[PDB]
C-alpha cells in the first residue's frame, strides 16, 4: 500500500508516441529556456523595492528547485536503507519517482515559507507574506512542469538546462551587462586608477573554466573483447567526472538547505545551527559549512577551509554511494547489453554472470573515487572562486557538454529510425 490516491491526483505530461523531430525537440527546448529567463526578469508582486538578493538567489540559491531538495531526502532514505526498495520492478521505480515528485511540491511550499520566514524580504506583513509565498512556490512549480516538458518533448534536461542557463546568463551579464565587470574595470583604466578587483573575478572564471574543462575530459577507458571476432578491438570510455554530476548537485544542495535552515531557524527560533547576523552565518555548523567563493579566496581562515573541503568530500562520497543502491549504473542491465554484442571485458570472462560480476565489483570504487574527486575539485574551484559560482560553472561545463552529445546522438538518430538503444 502507498500514497497512491493523492499520487494519482498529481498531474503529468502526455508523452506522444508520435514523431517528435529533432527540429521539434529543439524548438521545444528553446521555448522552455526563454520562459525561464523571462521568469528571471519579472519581480514578485510586493509593494516595495526593499531587498535585492539577486546575488544569493542568482548563484544557485533560490532557483533551487525544491526538486533538488526533495531528491536529497529520497536519496537519503532510499539510500541509508532506512526504507529499502528494489526498484527493478516498475513499481519501486515509479514508486521512488512518483513519491519524490510529490515531496518536490511539499518542499516547493516549505522552501517558499522558509525563505520569507528566513527574512529574505523584510516586511513580514502576514498578509503580504502569505501572498508572496504563493507566487513563489507556484513559480517553482512551473519549473517542475517545464522540466517535465523538456524531459519529454525536447533535448537535455530541465534542471540541467536551468542550471547551465542560470550560470551562463549570470556570466555574460555580470561580466558584460549593465553594471558589468569588464566595463567597470575598463572604465577604471580610463579613469586612470586601474582597479584589479574589477578584472579579478573575470579571470577567476576563465581559470576555473579552463580547469573544469581539463577535468571533464579525463575518462576511464575499459578495453573490450572482440565481438565473435579475434584480436584487440574495444576501448570503451566512461565519464569519470559526469558520473558524479547529479551527485555533487545534491551535495552543494545540502549545504544550501543548511545555510537557509540555519538562518531560518535562527530569526524564527533558537540558534540550533548557528549565529548568523549580517545576513549569513558567522558561527556554528552553518559557518563551518559555508562556501568561501564570490570574488577572492579567503586565506584569513585556514581551518575554515580544511573543514569545508573535508565536509564536502565526505558529503559527495555519500550521495554517490546513495546513487549506487538506487539508480546509477545498474550491472544487471549492463549484463545483457554487454552480452547481445557479446563483448566481454579485455581481461576476460565472456559469461553473463561472469562479466556482470567483474562489473558489480569495479563500480563502487569508481563511483566513490569519482565524486571524491569532483567534490574536491568543485570545492577548490570555489576557493579560487569564479563568476556564476565556481561549483555552478563546473556543473554547467559538464551539463553543457552532455548536452552537446545529446545534440549529436539526436542528429544521427534523425536518420536510422531503429537504433534508439545503441
From Swiss-Prot:
Pfam families: Plug_translocon, SecY. It is found in: Cell membrane. Signal peptide: none annotated. PROSITE patterns: SECY_1, SECY_2. The record marks 64, 68, 163, 168, 249, 395 as: Pore ring. One of its GO terms (cellular component) is plasma membrane. Keywords: Cell membrane, Membrane, Protein transport, Translocation, Transmembrane, Transmembrane helix, Transport. Residues 46-54, 119-129, 181-198, 267-301, 387 are extracellular. One of its GO terms (molecular function) is protein transmembrane transporter activity. It is a multi-pass membrane protein. GO terms for biological process: SRP-dependent cotranslational protein targeting to membrane, translocation. The chain crosses the membrane at residues 28-45, 55-77, 100-118, 130-150, 158-180, 199-216, 245-266, 302-320, 372-386, 388-401. Component of the Sec protein translocase complex. Heterotrimer consisting of alpha (SecY), beta (SecG) and gamma (SecE) subunits. The heterotrimers can form oligomers, although 1 heterotrimer is thought to be able to translocate proteins. Interacts with the ribosome. May interact with SecDF, and other proteins may be involved. Belongs to the SecY/SEC61-alpha family. The central subunit of the protein translocation channel SecYEG. Consists of two halves formed by TMs 1-5 and 6-10. These two domains form a lateral gate at the front which open onto the bilayer between TMs 2 and 7, and are clamped together by SecE at the back. The channel is closed by both a pore ring composed of hydrophobic SecY resides and a short helix (helix 2A) on the extracellular side of the membrane which forms a plug. The plug probably moves laterally to allow the channel to open. The ring and the pore may move independently. NCBIfam families: 3a0501s007, PRK08568.1-5. This is Protein translocase subunit SecY. It comes from Methanocaldococcus jannaschii (strain ATCC 43067 / DSM 2661 / JAL-1 / JCM 10045 / NBRC 100440) (Methanococcus jannaschii). The lineage of its organism: Archaea, Methanobacteriati, Methanobacteriota, Methanomada group, Methanococci. The gene is secY.
Amino acid at each position: 500500500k502507498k500514497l497512491i490516491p493523492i499520487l494519482e491526483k498529481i498531474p503529468e505530461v502526455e508523452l506522444p508516441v508520435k514523431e517528435i523531430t529533432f527540429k521539434e525537440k529543439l524548438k521545444w527546448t528553446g521555448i522552455v529556456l526563454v520562459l525561464y529567463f523571462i521568469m528571471g526578469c519579472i519581480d514578485v508582486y510586493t509593494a516595495g523595492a526593499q531587498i535585492p538578493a539577486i546575488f544569493g538567489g542568482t548563484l544557485i540559491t533560490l532557483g533551487i528547485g525544491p526538486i533538488v531538495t526533495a531528491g536529497i531526502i529520497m536519496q537519503l532514505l532510499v539510500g541509508s536503507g532506512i526504507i529499502q526498495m528494489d526498484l527493478s520492478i516498475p513499481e519501486n521505480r515509479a514508486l521512488f519517482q512518483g513519491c519524490q515528485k510529490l515531496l518536490s511540491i511539499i518542499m516547493c511550499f516549505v522552501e517558499a515559507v522558509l525563505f520569507v520566514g528566513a527574512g529574505a524580504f523584510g516586511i513580514l506583513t502576514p498578509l503580504l507574506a502569505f501572498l508572496v509565498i504563493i507566487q513563489i512556490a507556484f513559480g517553482s512549480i512551473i519549473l517542475i512542469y517545464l522540466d517535465e516538458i523538456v524531459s519529454k518533448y525536447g533535448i537535455g534536461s530541465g534542471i540541467g538546462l536551468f542550471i547551465a542557463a542560470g550560470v551562463s546568463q549570470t556570466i555574460f551579464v555580470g561580466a558584460l551587462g549593465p553594471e558589468g565587470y569588464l566595463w567597470k574595470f575598463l572604465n577604471s583604466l580610463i579613469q586612470g586608477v586601474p582597479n584589479i578587483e574589477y578584472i579579478a573575478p573575470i579571470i577567476g572564471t576563465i581559470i576555473v573554466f579552463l580547469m573544469v574543462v581539463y577535468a571533464e575530459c579525463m575518462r576511464v577507458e575499459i578495453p573490450l573483447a572482440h565481438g565473435r571476432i579475434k584480436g584487440a578491438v574495444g576501448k570503451y570510455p566512461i565519464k569519470f567526472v559526469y558520473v558524479s554530476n547529479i551527485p555533487v548537485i545534491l551535495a552543494a544542495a545540502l549545504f544550501a538547505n543548511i545555510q537557509l535552515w540555519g538562518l531560518a531557524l535562527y530569526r524564527m527560533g533558537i540558534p540550533i545551527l548557528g549565529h548568523y547576523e549580517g545576513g549569513r552565518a558567522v558561527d556554528g555548523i552553518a559557518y563551518y559549512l559555508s562556501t568561501p567563493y564570490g570574488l577572492s579566496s579567503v586565506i584569513s581562515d585556514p581551518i575554515h577551509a580544511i573543514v569545508y573541503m573535508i565536509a564536502m568530500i565526505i558529503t559527495c562520497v555519500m550521495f554517490g554511494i546513495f546513487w549506487v543502491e538506487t539508480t546509477g549504473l545498474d550491472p544487471k542491465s549492463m549484463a545483457k547489453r554487454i552480452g547481445s554484442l557479446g563483448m566481454a571485458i579485455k581481461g576476460f570472462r565472456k559469461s553473463e554472470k561472469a562479466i556482470e560480476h567483474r562489473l558489480k565489483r569495479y563500480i563502487p570504487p569508481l563511483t566513490v573515487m569519482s565524486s571524491a574527486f569532483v567534490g574536491f575539485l568543485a570545492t577548490i574551484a570555489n576557493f579560487i572562486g569564479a563568476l556564476g559560482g565556481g561549483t555552478g560553472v563546473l556543473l554547467t561545463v559538464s551539463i553543457v557538454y552532455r548536452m552537446y552529445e545529446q545534440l549529436l546522438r539526436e542528429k544521427v538518430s534523425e536518420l536510422h529510425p531503429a537504433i534508439a538503444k545503441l
